[PDB]
Amino acid sequence: STGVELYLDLLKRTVSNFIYQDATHVAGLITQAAFVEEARESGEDYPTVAHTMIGMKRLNNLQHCVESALRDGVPGDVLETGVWRGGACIFARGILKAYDVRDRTVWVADSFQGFPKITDDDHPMDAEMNLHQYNAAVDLPTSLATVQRNFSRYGLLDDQVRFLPGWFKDTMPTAPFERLAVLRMDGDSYGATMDVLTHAYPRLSPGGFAIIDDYCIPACREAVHEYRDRHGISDEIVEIDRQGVYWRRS
Amino acid sequence: STGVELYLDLLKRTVSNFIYQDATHVAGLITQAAFVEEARESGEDYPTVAHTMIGMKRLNNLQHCVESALRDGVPGDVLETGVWRGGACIFARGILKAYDVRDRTVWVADSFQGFPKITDDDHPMDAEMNLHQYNAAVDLPTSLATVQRNFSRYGLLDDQVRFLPGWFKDTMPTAPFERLAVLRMDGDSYGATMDVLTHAYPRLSPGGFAIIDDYCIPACREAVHEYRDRHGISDEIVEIDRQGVYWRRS
Ligand SMILES: CC[C@H]1OC(=O)C[C@@H](O)[C@H](C)[C@@H](O[C@@H]2O[C@H](C)[C@@H](O[C@H]3C[C@@](C)(O)[C@@H](O)[C@H](C)O3)[C@H](N(C)C)[C@H]2O)[C@@H](CC=O)C[C@@H](C)C(=O)/C=C/C(C)=C/[C@@H]1CO[C@@H]1O[C@H](C)[C@@H](O)[C@@H](O)[C@H]1OC
Ligand SMILES: CC[C@H]1OC(=O)C[C@@H](O)[C@H](C)[C@@H](O[C@@H]2O[C@H](C)[C@@H](O[C@H]3C[C@@](C)(O)[C@@H](O)[C@H](C)O3)[C@H](N(C)C)[C@H]2O)[C@@H](CC=O)C[C@@H](C)C(=O)/C=C/C(C)=C/[C@@H]1CO[C@@H]1O[C@H](C)[C@@H](O)[C@@H](O)[C@H]1OC
């Protein structure tokens, strides 16, 4: 193991808190608070303290995507839409740091208020799920200042981290990046997924990676297929774990 | 910031839990549970969750001592006497791993049961302190299996970590190392300090480092001075923070 490999391995174990193994919130299908290795490994629990809920398999995927882009010379920044406490974005910034990359940015996009209240404009599938109901139960609303604080604890808050606070329908169309190498979508709903595909995906470079964290949710999956059909996108959808998938843009 | 530097920096932040900032036990002069940055920085609190209580200044000192020995070709292993949850030894093993050192071992010596009960054989200063009384209050007794589990969580449990379970007066005289490059003493009492200086210090290589974690405790300081006077040791005692000192063996 080289210094870089050790750092990034430890950074994954730290943002997902395999080190101290915090309890999960009891919500959804999780009936007990105890830390379960297999659940944290696959990002299936709702950590009480950890900085990311995506788990080790999806952290490994993010590493693969960012490293492949760097190795192949795919131009552009990294954007995560839906960041919670910031752990996955912290990890992304750590990857760039490990390779001393000075000319790419990690964009951190969130409401910083949890899921939005349902309105009449919402897709019927989104209305039925009403994700907003879960905000407090899994401690989702996390302020911009809290996320910035978290980056600082790792020594990774600097000007290669830029924040996009607001609802995606508002922030994405005019977000000030020109190109993306990795687009990581983690907003769960048809609405959030369609907002980001519509307004950010056209800036994803050829050879770049589009990661759909929540593909197991029917509303998210519906947005993905509607978008791909509309644009004639046939790039193979590759499964990461029981939740996430990705494709590589050609 | 190279891979190695980033890894060791994160490792220090992780074993001391600057990342998630756990509460302290309320004991001694600490009257409130809150995490206080300045106290964790100087190793002055009693972490409820963190794997080491020595803090960042003493972790930095340990890094300096191990790196200097490696740089200067000082032969031998690393021994810590008094390891608690294992954080400082985990860090030591991480340093060797970062530099791909395959021919040195980290020895992890502890009762794995906390401070010993006082008897009439104890030095009067040890008897007056009666450190045993604090075992539960700071969660000091930590089993070998727990310490091994903690190493595993960082990916650092391998054949270059060897354990010496028992009281120092029993384990040190025949411990199966031949030479030390760094001897880190963290047992607080006159007795533990004198046991280890008596039985381990002769195996410290010239150019090696003797670290006294608890020099601020009068009983510990008494043993250090008695031992140095007896052996005619005059190497400068260099202060680290409000607790620890070290010297380099001529
Ligand atoms: C705590 C927040 C979390 O809530 C949840 O997980 C809530 C879910 O358990 C949800 C309730 C499930 O619905 C219920 O599943 C049960 C297994 C069914 O009951 C059994 C028994 C039975 C007899 O009914 C049988 O017929 C039937 C087949 O199975 C339920 N049946 C009534 C049908 C079914 O209702 C689910 C489908 C399964 O996983 C429904 C579909 C639409 C879905 O996937 C929705 C996801 C949601 C709402 C996720 C949020 C948001 O969490 C996010 O999840 C992502 C995947 C993560 O990556 C994170 O982004 C996370 O964000 C915090
Ligand atoms: C929780 C375990 C911890 O307990 C503790 O810290 C307990 C100590 O606060 C202890 C109580 C202090 O004694 C008390 O000090 C107070 C400051 C005095 O009160 C004031 C007020 C006054 C009016 O008395 C006046 O005279 C004057 C202003 O002092 C107290 N007076 C009553 C005199 C005096 O009692 C202490 C000296 C100062 O720190 C005494 C000397 C001998 C000492 O250093 C003992 C250390 C011990 C026993 C440490 C253990 C073990 O902790 C270890 O500490 C190491 C340094 C760490 O690295 C760890 O290894 C840790 O192990 C877990």
Ligand SMILES: Nc1ncnc2c1ncn2[C@@H]1O[C@H](CSCC[C@H](N)C(=O)O)[C@@H](O)[C@H]1O
């Ligand atoms: N329409 C929308 N606009 C902006 N943010 C949204 C949104 N819908 C959901 N969110 C945000 O999406 C996030 C989903 S959870 C994100 C998990 C995170 N990637 C991790 O590493 O753990 C929440 O932080 C929530 O505030």
Ligand SMILES: Nc1ncnc2c1ncn2[C@@H]1O[C@H](CSCC[C@H](N)C(=O)O)[C@@H](O)[C@H]1O
């Ligand atoms: N005489 C003795 N023999 C063996 N172990 C002892 C001892 N006296 C104290 N100990 C052990 O010394 C340790 C003191 S605390 C050690 C702190 C540790 N270095 C850290 O990094 O946080 C305890 O684990 C206790 O069990």
Ligand SMILES: [Mg+2]
């Ligand atoms: Mg998700």
Ligand SMILES: [Mg+2]
């Ligand atoms: Mg000490």
